[PDB]
Design a protein around this nucleic acid. Structure first.
Ligand SMILES: [Mg+2]
Ligand SMILES: [Mg+2]
Ligand SMILES: [Mg+2]
Ligand SMILES: [Mg+2]
Ligand SMILES: [Mg+2]
Ligand SMILES: [Mg+2]
Ligand SMILES: [Mg+2]
Ligand SMILES: [Mg+2]
Ligand SMILES: [Mg+2]
Ligand SMILES: [Mg+2]
Ligand SMILES: [Mg+2]
Ligand SMILES: [Mg+2]
Ligand SMILES: [Mg+2]
Ligand SMILES: [Mg+2]
Ligand SMILES: [Mg+2]
Ligand SMILES: [Mg+2]
Ligand SMILES: [Mg+2]
Ligand SMILES: [Mg+2]
Ligand SMILES: [Mg+2]
Ligand SMILES: [Mg+2]
Ligand SMILES: [Mg+2]
Ligand SMILES: [Mg+2]
Ligand SMILES: [Mg+2]
Ligand SMILES: [Mg+2]
Ligand SMILES: [Mg+2]
Ligand SMILES: [Mg+2]
Ligand SMILES: [Mg+2]
Ligand SMILES: [Mg+2]
Ligand SMILES: [Mg+2]
Ligand SMILES: [Mg+2]
Ligand SMILES: [Mg+2]
Ligand SMILES: [Mg+2]
Ligand SMILES: [Mg+2]
Ligand SMILES: [Mg+2]
Ligand SMILES: [Mg+2]
Ligand SMILES: [Mg+2]
Ligand SMILES: [Mg+2]
Ligand SMILES: [Mg+2]
Ligand SMILES: [Mg+2]
Ligand SMILES: [Mg+2]
Ligand SMILES: [Mg+2]
Ligand SMILES: [Mg+2]
Ligand SMILES: [Mg+2]
Ligand SMILES: [Mg+2]
Ligand SMILES: [Mg+2]
Ligand SMILES: [Mg+2]
Ligand SMILES: [Mg+2]
Ligand SMILES: [Mg+2]
Ligand SMILES: [Mg+2]
Ligand SMILES: [Mg+2]
Lengths: 116, 155, 70
RNA sequence: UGCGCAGAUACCGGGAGGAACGCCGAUGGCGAAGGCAGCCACCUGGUCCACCCGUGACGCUGAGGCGCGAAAGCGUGGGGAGCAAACCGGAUUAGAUACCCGGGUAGUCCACGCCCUAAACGAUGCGCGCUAGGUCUCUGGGUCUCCUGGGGGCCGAAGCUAACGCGUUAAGCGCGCCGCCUGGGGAGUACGGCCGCAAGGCUGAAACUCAAAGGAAUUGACGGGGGCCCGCACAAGCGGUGGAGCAUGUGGU
């Protein structure tokens, strides 16, 4: 009911899960998927195969809105971060460009004890 | 084999079909070192498959073996506590032994009374896509593509 | 790979307003290239850093950028 | 556990607030020590180089005193994003008063005043004189393959050392002065004193007790340490035992 036909796809990859959001060129999302959106529940979400399916689940949902051109945005280190991208390129959606925007602080916030 | 490659034994060609795949299969049938018994079973079973079906028992034997060959299986690998079922390809040598063993094992689960009757019928079913040997093959190929989430553990 | 000082002219390391030269010392991201890649001396790197950081406040040089690759 | 249909997570825009400065960044620089990293301005200390100008032994160390002194903690008032003692939960576990997970108060930040400890470490007090070099580097001067200062490293002469190691940055050779040690436990405890709002600090024993406590190095042995490699050790595979009945041996009775 939109027919954007082009936009941006954001990949958020953490070690506990990978989730994909698909937006129109000004950034407002259209459809999305995750490791939990597909059947996986636990640590299986952090697997690259989950990232592969989550990418394809989101890609197919974007097809329903007519998406053809896709600019890829990647945020975070994690398994299937790459496997999510390689699933996007062969999803049928033409990948316009790939950019790594992962937010890195300038040492502003004290991390949790886990990260020190 | 910690040291060498453990070279494969070279079986004698068959006395009848001159084929090594037949001699290896006859061995899988042999029990307690009675090869004369095993060959008579396998060769009489060639009569059953060549009469009740009008094709070459040579070609059906190969056709039955090819259908039981699994392309993928699962293996266990210890990772962070309890291990996992890890899918991976099957060596062409391993596809040799597995299909033959499954064919002989499945034929002895058959109803038929006499041995050669079970073998011929199993080979006939296996060649047609059905039969107990193909079920084991299909069930293994189901283990792969199921734990396919662990395809990053290939090793 | 060549070093930045090697392919360059006689430039003022203290001029924070010359972006064309200062841009050459930033990476694909907004970071400052280490001495291995700038070919600059110890003192020259100390001077370049503060003048680069100066231009970052005037909006002439970026704080950080986005990598188009991978 | 928790959060989410009162619409989270993820994505774009806007706003608020606090704390910390990515790259540069270094094996680097600065300081007496603690310690000191965005940028700008002001105030300001130390320090190093050249000139060989001036003073003319004016020097060194330093019991007391005085000032400084990471963190944590204390008082008053602020502030409070993130982290997080205590604590509230979830798991794990034989138990979990823990490691792991979700929360979360003090605190961590600011001001003003206390507190005076530390593996406050180079476990090496300060000043000066002397004793092979080689190399890396920060920063000055120079007639700028280099020479010459002042720092920061690594090898190493002589020598010292119980040994490890130190070695023009001495743990060498000398001299001046301060502090400090005299077996281990008791004990940095008791008492008295001085200081502190408190927490506690500085000072600091005795009885009793033991034939040790310790340092460095050696060969082994061990590691839920590392590398390399073997055996039916595992894996791959084939037939077994464990069940039945019996034969035999042992336990027990
Ligand atoms: Mg998970
Ligand atoms: Mg274990
Ligand atoms: Mg709920
Ligand atoms: Mg609710
Ligand atoms: Mg926002
Ligand atoms: Mg607020
Ligand atoms: Mg760094
Ligand atoms: Mg110093
Ligand atoms: Mg220190
Ligand atoms: Mg100044
Ligand atoms: Mg000054
Ligand atoms: Mg004179
Ligand atoms: Mg005179
Ligand atoms: Mg003095
Ligand atoms: Mg004094
Ligand atoms: Mg004081
Ligand atoms: Mg203090
Ligand atoms: Mg404090
Ligand atoms: Mg307070
Ligand atoms: Mg927290
Ligand atoms: Mg916690
Ligand atoms: Mg608990
Ligand atoms: Mg419990
Ligand atoms: Mg236990
Ligand atoms: Mg004191
Ligand atoms: Mg002395
Ligand atoms: Mg010079
Ligand atoms: Mg020196
Ligand atoms: Mg040495
Ligand atoms: Mg000597
Ligand atoms: Mg000396
Ligand atoms: Mg000594
Ligand atoms: Mg004393
Ligand atoms: Mg004593
Ligand atoms: Mg004592
Ligand atoms: Mg004490
Ligand atoms: Mg007394
Ligand atoms: Mg007292
Ligand atoms: Mg009092
Ligand atoms: Mg208290
Ligand atoms: Mg105490
Ligand atoms: Mg000791
Ligand atoms: Mg010792
Ligand atoms: Mg030895
Ligand atoms: Mg060993
Ligand atoms: Mg053990
Ligand atoms: Mg372990
Ligand atoms: Mg064995
Ligand atoms: Mg085995
Ligand atoms: Mg028995």
């Amino acid at each position: 009911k939109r027919q954007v036909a082009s936009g941006r796809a954001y990949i958020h990859a953490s070690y506990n899960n990978t989730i994909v959001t698909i937006t129109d060129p000004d950034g407002n999302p259209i459809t999305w998927s995750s490791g939990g959106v597909i059947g996986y529940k636990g640590s299986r979400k952090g697997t690259p195969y989950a990232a592969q399916l989550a990418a394809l689940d989101a890609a197919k949902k974007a097809m329903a809105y007519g998406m053809q051109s896709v600019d890829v945005i990647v945020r975070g280190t994690g398994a299937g971060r790459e496997q999510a991208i390689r699933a996007l390129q062969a999803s049928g959606l033409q990948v316009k460009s790939i950019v790594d925007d992962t937010p890195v602080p300038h040492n502003g916030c004290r991390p949790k004890k886990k990260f020190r | 084999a910690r040291r060498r490659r453990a070279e494969v034994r070279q079986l004698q060609p068959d006395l009848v079909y001159g084929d090594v795949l037949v001699t290896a299969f006859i061995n899988k049938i042999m029990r307690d070192g009675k090869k004369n018994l095993a060959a008579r079973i396998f060769y009489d079973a060639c009569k059953i498959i060549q009469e009740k079906t009008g094709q070459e028992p040579l070609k059906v034997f190969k056709q039955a073996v090819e259908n039981v060959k699994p392309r993928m299986e699962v293996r266990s690998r210890r990772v962070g506590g309890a291990n996992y079922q890890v899918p991976m390809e099957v060596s062409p040598r391993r596809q040799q032994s597995l299909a033959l063993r499954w064919l002989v094992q499945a034929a002895n689960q058959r109803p038929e009374r006499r041995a050669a009757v079970r073998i011929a019928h199993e080979l006939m079913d296996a060649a047609e896509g059905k039969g107990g040997a193909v079920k084991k093959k299909e069930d293994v190929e189901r283990m792969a593509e199921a734990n396919r989430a662990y395809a990053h553990y290939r090793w | 790979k060549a070093k930045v000082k090697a392919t360059l002219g006689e430039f003022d390391l203290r001029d924070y307003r010359n972006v064309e030269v200062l841009k050459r010392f930033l990476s694909e991201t907004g970071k400052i290239l280490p001495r291995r890649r700038t070919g600059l001396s110890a003192k020259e790197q100390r001077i370049l850093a503060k003048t680069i950081k100066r231009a970052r406040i005037l909006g002439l040089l970026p704080f950080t950028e986005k990598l188009v690759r991978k």
